Design a protein around this ligand. Structure first.
Ligand SMILES: CC[N+](CC)(CC)Cc1ccccc1
Ligand SMILES: CC[N+](CC)(CC)Cc1ccccc1
Ligand SMILES: [Mg+2]
Ligand SMILES: [Mg+2]
Lengths: 481, 501
């Protein structure tokens, strides 16, 4: 339309806009708890089974039938498409429970036109409520004077109009051109102050070791360089002085030969413990990003990595023929370096990429990897490769996003909440729920609790640190605020 | 300003007040702190993370693990130091005597202190001055911390304190300062004297209202309390049963604010229940009764106790049924579950509910009750109740019903009070099921302890229509069938809400 081209930003509703008696269910107050993400469908159907005096299975079939009867609106989708081509900022703002949102994301394919998807079950907010409009506007930094909102309901358009956003009621299209927390900041400030103090005191990132993921009763072991590299890659808002001190510890790490890095400091290296491609890939990828190394110096190390494939063609974990292992996340971090340096189209990487893609798509990642038992870690690292090399990894985006959507608010560990927040936001989905619960678990000194990010399987030793946890939580807070 | 050195003069000033608030740390209890890394527990307790533990936001393992990094001290040394500190704890003989004297003067006496749940659990078992308090307000049970004014606002509101007649005793001036802002007079406890200064939410009610409207409408429409059955405790996808009378009787005993019109309607269901004969009741309606399934003492006890309470039946009519129950003992003397020699069963909650009716009708001194009462007592004390009972798998159900009996007949069950309180404290916030939170809140408050943690978490699981989720309260053990309803869950939750406001 000639109307929408006057606006920089268009916000789309889903229902009866892009998609076209179960009404007694969706009007019930319990359904609003479901829409808000407060409960899941199983518990919501149990309750509604009682209030609606209907066998639970009948409500499930009525709902299943109702979702599958949804059909795209071809006029609106094409409209969405033309706006996308015009480089508009486009957002989706809609009430829908989480599982329905999973089905609809899998089932349709217009999602790609959106710069950002704001769904009620991921926000714990519902669409007539002005709070959801205010959340959208500040989080997306929307200039309401150049923003128009498309909905079928007048309550929604009236609310948006009160924030100064024009409206298009979707037969007829009614157009009206409209012309007219500090707790987060405190928690961010506390956390930044905590992280900056820890890392200024100990730029070689500390770690602790134990036999459990919470590292209860863990002992101090601060003689591996990997955590330092993880933080440098993962928390993108370190002050320059800290970046420098941590870079210094990497460049001067003594578990180092010919740009092959070892996990351990020399003093702590088990006799005969080999260099590994995870530590090597991660530090090399950081040094190249910060212009401490050239592709010329890295490429021979990358060939050794290609030389390290097993009989199935998969690049292995260690520079040691007598210690053959594989790991989907080590595969990912190798592939990241490969695409960074120009190796992205080497045929010898095909089975390593196939392995990673299959690990995603088979849901085998729900079992964790050899060194990373928590499934969201695989998803997070995959999202880094997929979003940073999007043309090369196009076919990963939708399946990765599907998996992440189902895992929103599925675990209580703060670091796991952080990874889901960061990964979903990089994929254009706003996960406010995990964000809210992440804030609640900050400790009083500003740091989050220790978490066992990775594992030495031979000794079932978990490694982790408050620095790692806090670094991820701060990235999550910054990326959504 | 008024410096006091005379223990006599102290007693004379405290007597001028109706309410005395006592601190624990360095007032009633005293301890030492210096025992690779730090060598002073004072460095732990001062740390910000320790405030999270004190407020109940984390447990000891969690706080130590974090402190082991901040204080650069091996976690296991921090653990040893705490245990040594706690083991070193001594009672203050002067202040417990002052406390005891105030108690013997029928003063209203409260305890307000910062202590973490594990520590407070140990202290409660270890010492025995707690009986002198009318109410106990501990930071880990309140998720509030003592300097903060809102812990004072909470105490004053929870206990309906007249701050004009209230005096607070504490060793920390910051605590006294904050108390004086609320008009409470202060008494600083020093190593060498006393300093005496004479001094002159909306969400909760919305939730209460919504929950009351929910339950009143549900019980009006279905005064025979509905029930669902499934093989799992949250009854996900459970089927409608609604053919047992016991839920109706449990609601009448457990939620004490039903309007008279609902009470009348539910009482009619009990009296017109076809599964009864000569004032013995059967769990099931006839249409669902298994062939040869007997009447049982649990439904009977709870039904007769209610009908007596509401003057539907005389003591004269109950006492013969109660004598039959005494005739239902086994070779160990424990009263059994069913009116049926061919189906011998014992269950500790059924025993509790039979004992309740016994004491209520005048049978409380009958010697034939001894083995039943010792069964329930050993069941508590042996921690065997952590395994559930035959018909009630959730451990807090046994503690809840025990607390009804023990608080309602306190002269006969004195020896139960402290062990039961000890157990309940260890269970604060130990499970997520709303009904279980509600049982713990209700039971602890009857025992004088405010469990605000479970309360706040209970509030957050109310659904938008005012009802709580269904929960399987009791079990048909053979088929592993759970029974429950939203009415049951909401009734226990509303009672917990009322009892803590
Ligand atoms: C970077 C080290 N690693 C893989 C070698 C992380 C995935 C785990 C590990 C650490 C120490 C011993 C063994 C394995
Ligand atoms: C009062 C009913 N009863 C004991 C008879 C106590 C909860 C459980 C029960 C219900 C149904 C069948 C068997 C036992
Ligand atoms: Mg709509
Ligand atoms: Mg004190």
């Amino acid at each position: 339309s000639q109307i929408l081209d006057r606006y920089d930003t268009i916000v789309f509703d889903l229902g009866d806009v892009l998609l076209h008696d179960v009404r007694k269910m969706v009007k019930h107050p319990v359904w609003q708890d479901l829409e808000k993400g407060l409960i899941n469908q199983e518990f919501a159907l149990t309750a509604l089974s009682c209030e609606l005096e209907t066998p639970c299975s009948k409500l499930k079939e009525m709902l299943e039938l109702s979702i599958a009867s949804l059909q795209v609106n071809p006029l609106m989708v094409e409209v969405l498409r033309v706006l996308h081509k015009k480089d508009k900022q486009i957002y989706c703002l809609s009430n829908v429970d989480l599982e329905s949102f999973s089905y609809l994301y899998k089932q349709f394919d217009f999602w790609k036109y959106f710069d950002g998807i704001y769904v009620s079950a991921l926000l714990q907010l519902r669409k007539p409520n002005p709070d959801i409009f205010q959340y959208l506007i500040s989080s997306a930094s929307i200039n309401t004077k150049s923003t128009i909102f498309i909905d079928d309901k007048s309550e929604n358009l009236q609310e948006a109009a009160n924030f100064g956003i024009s409206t298009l009621k979707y037969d007829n299209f009614e157009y009206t051109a409209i012309e007219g927390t500090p707790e987060i900041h405190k928690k961010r400030t506390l956390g930044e102050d905590y992280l900056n103090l820890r890392l200024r005191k100990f730029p070689f990132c500390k770690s602790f070791v134990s036999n459990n993921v919470e590292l209860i009763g863990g002992e101090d072991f601060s003689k591996e360089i990997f955590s330092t590299a993880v933080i440098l890659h993962s928390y993108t808002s370190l002050p320059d002085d800290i970046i420098a001190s941590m870079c210094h510890e990497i460049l001067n790490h003594d578990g180092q030969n010919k740009l092959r890095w070892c996990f351990y400091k020399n003093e702590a290296r088990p006799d005969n413990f080999p260099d590994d491609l995870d530590t090597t890939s991660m530090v090399l990828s950081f040094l190249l990003n910060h212009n401490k190394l050239t592709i010329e110096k890295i490429i021979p190390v990358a060939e050794q990595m290609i030389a390290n494939r097993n009989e199935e063609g998969i690049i292995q974990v260690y520079f040691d023929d007598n210690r053959p292992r594989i790991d989907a996340i080590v595969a990912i971090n190798v592939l990241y370096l490969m695409h960074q340096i120009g190796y992205g189209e080497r045929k010898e990487l095909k089975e390593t990429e196939a392995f990673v893609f299959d690990f995603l798509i088979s849901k085998e990642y729900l079992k964790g990897t050899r060194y990373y038992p928590a499934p969201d870690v695989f998803l997070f690292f995959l999202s880094r490769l997929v979003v940073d090399f999007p043309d090369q990894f196009e076919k990963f985006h939708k399946p990765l996003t599907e998996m992440l959507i189902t895992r929103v608010n599925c675990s209580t560990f703060p670091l796991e909440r952080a990874l889901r927040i960061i990964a979903l936001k990089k994929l254009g989905i706003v996960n406010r729920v995990d964000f809210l619960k992440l804030l609640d678990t900050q400790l009083a000194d500003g740091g989050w609790p220790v978490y066992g990010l990775f594992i030495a399987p031979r000794s079932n030793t978990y490694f982790g640190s408050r620095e790692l946890s806090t670094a991820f939580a701060l990235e999550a807070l910054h990326i959504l605020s």
